[PDB]
């Protein structure tokens, strides 16, 4: 949300004034603004983000580093050029054959001319070369492994959905990654960093006291269970022990989505790519029950509720336990002076803050009067507006922050006492929740099966999720397949047996990649990563688990058994470890219902939005649809006695309860509002009988 370029605002163009030509990618954006990452709504191109290496000219332009090359000798003098000198000069590529001396190898070299043209210059006129690959791309987009295989649409979706993951309770690091998980975590701020070197004195879950090498000590306080700005947890647990020596600029304490320093936006799950029983139909995803049992995907959500005890014309409000008509049953959680006790679990509709207002004198209905005459309960002139926890929410109560006028705290005018109650729950993963990988392959949870009716391997290990095949070839995102195979390679660990020299694929691999351990972390950078021949070479020798058992052959597939029926599948199926996230589009934030609730003020429609109850807008196109069916009575229903027939609604509710027929609908209310507005504009409007 920092590093964001936004072309709309005051002094800038708005979205209705926005033409189509400003939203494209001009060829001067290369190295100055990422072409991938942009919000996929109605803001495509108006909002962007800076490049990785980009740096701001003092006149407000966007400079970019370049390696200058003199006479075909690539130097190291790094010169920042803005887009004008990017057009003056000529610009080479970083994936070019530099012959270990600054010298190019082949004379015919890719280059960029001024107007975005791409040519083959002879290797003598090249005066600038790029500083690395992945220069064109943003921060978040450079965290996508195998990005160069994916199409730009699904890579765009992946970059916009990688910013939406929620902090899990465990936060395990990804196996296959980029370089940008460590650097873009210690630069993100939410990781406590050892300021100056030294040794650890005292750790806890709350503070770390470092011992600097010269006398001084310093306590790094944590942030435990603080609410974020979108309701998610912000825990910081330490990762150092009491005798460790730290250096300056070291990670000392993981943040929300971090793990031993680097980013962890999700977990590493065993995936398989068959279409299973129609539950993974059209982007839907199934899961094991192991993810629910072992709390693999589980996020802590923290919600802030707030009430103020303000002044009024009749008198003054009061936070207290003397509420009105309410069984001393629900007054068990509340303390002696209002608010609930810390740790008492609440449900939807419970009392949080006992708070009662005066009402005045209103004459009673006679039936209410005689009920008070029979039972002897008094009038109780105060009226109760307590802070009730809203519908469809529950969970524990972490902390109660209370203010007061009596402590002389800063409160606005006419407010006597403020209190905030933090409520928190621990959401399991559930069907309907939104999951996605790092490749734009989103999809809701179709069905959480048990662990036994899940396709397990020959080693009795069940798979954990099952994606669909039909979403792969038509969306052009086989980065998920390359991630899947390389993830299995990194899970099992390889050993290129270089007994008689090095094999032909593995020649230009780096050293200490000739063999690897199980659960060893790997990384491909974005535009210089695992080649496909290298993936076949790693996948060929992928040393067995515990027995002599190569579960995944050279093709990258395996013989799954059906957990439900029992027969083996007749064809081998791709398996592997894919790194998937839990998006912030949970079902519990979306489900909503209304029978009868609050009503709008001027017009008499039901209100709007999940904050209130509200109904869904039965808009104009739906009116056309039900006209086109010819359903006339349901249209009369939905436009009179569900929305605006003010005397009709209570008759409908009464007739439903009494079990009678629904009465005949009357005139809507917004028509009458229209009638009085037209009579206000000096237009004689009248209804004529015959």
């Amino acid at each position: 949300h920092k590093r964001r370029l936004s072309a709309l605002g005051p002094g800038g163009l708005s979205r209705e004034r926005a033409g189509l030509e400003v939203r494209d990618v001009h060829p001067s954006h290369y190295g100055r603004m990422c072409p991938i990452e942009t919000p996929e709504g109605p803001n495509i191109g108006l909002i962007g983000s800076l490049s990785v290496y980009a740096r701001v000219n003092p006149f407000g332009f966007i400079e970019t580093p370049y390696r200058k090359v003199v006479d075909g000798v690539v130097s190291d003098e790094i010169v920042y050029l803005t887009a004008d000198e990017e057009d003056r000069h000529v610009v080479a590529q970083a994936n070019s054959p530099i012959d270990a001396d600054g010298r190019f190898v082949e004379p015919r070299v890719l280059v960029r001319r001024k107007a975005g043209e791409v040519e083959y210059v002879p290797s003598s006129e090249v005066d600038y070369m790029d500083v690395s690959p992945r220069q064109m791309v943003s921060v978040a987009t450079a965290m996508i492994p195998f990005l160069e295989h994916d199409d730009a649409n699904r890579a765009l979706m992946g970059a916009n959905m990688q910013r939406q993951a929620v902090p899990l309770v465990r936060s395990e690091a990804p196996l296959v990654g980029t370089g940008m998980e460590l650097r873009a975590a210690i630069d993100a701020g939410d990781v406590v960093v050892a300021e100056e070197s030294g040794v650890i004195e005292e750790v806890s879950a709350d503070y770390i006291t470092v011992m600097h090498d010269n006398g001084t000590r310093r306590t790094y306080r944590m942030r435990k269970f603080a609410r974020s700005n979108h309701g998610t947890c912000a825990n910081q647990c330490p990762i150092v022990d009491a005798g460790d020596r730290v250096e300056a600029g070291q990670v000392i304490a993981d943040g929300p989505c971090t793990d031993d320093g680097e980013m962890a936006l999700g977990k590493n799950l065993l995936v398989a790519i068959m279409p299973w029983e129609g539950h993974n139909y059209e982007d839907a995803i199934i899961l094991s029950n192991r993810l629910v049992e072992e709390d693999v995907l589980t996020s802590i959500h923290i919600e802030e509720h707030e009430i103020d005890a303000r002044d009024t014309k009749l008198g003054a409000e009061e936070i207290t336990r003397d509420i009105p008509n309410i069984s001393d049953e629900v007054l068990a959680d509340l303390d002696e002076r209002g608010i609930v006790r810390i740790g008492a679990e609440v449900r939807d509709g419970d009392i949080l803050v006992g708070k009662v207002t005066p009402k005045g004198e209103t004459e009673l209905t006679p039936e209410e009067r005689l009920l008070r005459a029979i039972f002897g309960e008094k009038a109780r002139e105060v009226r109760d507006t307590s802070l009730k926890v809203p519908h469809g929410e529950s969970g524990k109560v972490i902390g109660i922050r209370v203010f007061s006028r009596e402590d002389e705290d800063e409160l606005p005018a006419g407010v006597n006492e403020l209190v905030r109650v933090y409520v928190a729950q621990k959401r399991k993963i559930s069907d309907g929740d939104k999951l996605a990988g790092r490749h734009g392959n989103k999809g809701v949870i179709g069905k959480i099966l048990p662990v036994e009716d899940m396709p397990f391997l020959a080693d009795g290990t069940p798979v954990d999720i099952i994606l669909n095949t039909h979403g792969v070839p038509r969306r052009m995102n086989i980065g998920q397949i390359l991630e899947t195979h390389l993830g299995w390679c990194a899970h099992s660990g390889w050993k290129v047996d270089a007994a008689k020299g090095v094999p032909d694929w593995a020649a230009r691999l780096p050293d200490e990649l000739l063999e690897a351990q199980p659960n060893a972390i790997v990384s491909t950078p974005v535009f210089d990563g695992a080649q496909e021949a290298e993936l076949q070479g790693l996948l060929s020798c992928t040393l067995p688990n515990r027995d002599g058992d190569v579960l995944v052959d050279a093709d990258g597939k395996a013989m799954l058994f059906d957990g439900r029926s029992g027969e083996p599948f007749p064809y081998p199926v791709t398996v592997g470890y894919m790194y998937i996230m839990k998006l912030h589009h949970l079902v519990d934030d979306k489900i909503h219902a209304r029978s009868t609730g609050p009503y709008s003020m001027i017009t008499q429609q039901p209100l709007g939005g999940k904050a209130q109850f509200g109904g869904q807008r039965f808009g104009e196109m739906e009116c056309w649809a039900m006209q086109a069916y010819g359903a006339a009575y349901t249209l009369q229903e939905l436009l009179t006695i569900k929305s605006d027939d003010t005397v009709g609604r209570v008759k409908v509710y009464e007739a439903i309860v009494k079990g009678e027929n629904i009465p005949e609908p009357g005139i809507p209310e917004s028509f009458k509002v229209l009638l009085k507005e037209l009579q206000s504009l000096c237009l004689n409007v009248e209804v004529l009988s015959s």
Partner: peptide, 27 residues
């Protein structure tokens, strides 16, 4: 590397970058 308590994550990078990633909040 150049970050002291980093995890050991092996890279497939065939090239070498001269310039480090800058101070990502400088803007």
């Amino acid at each position: 590397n150049s970050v002291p308590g980093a995890p050991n994550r092996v890279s497939f990078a065939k090239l070498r970058e001269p310039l480090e990633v800058p101070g990502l909040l400088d803007v």
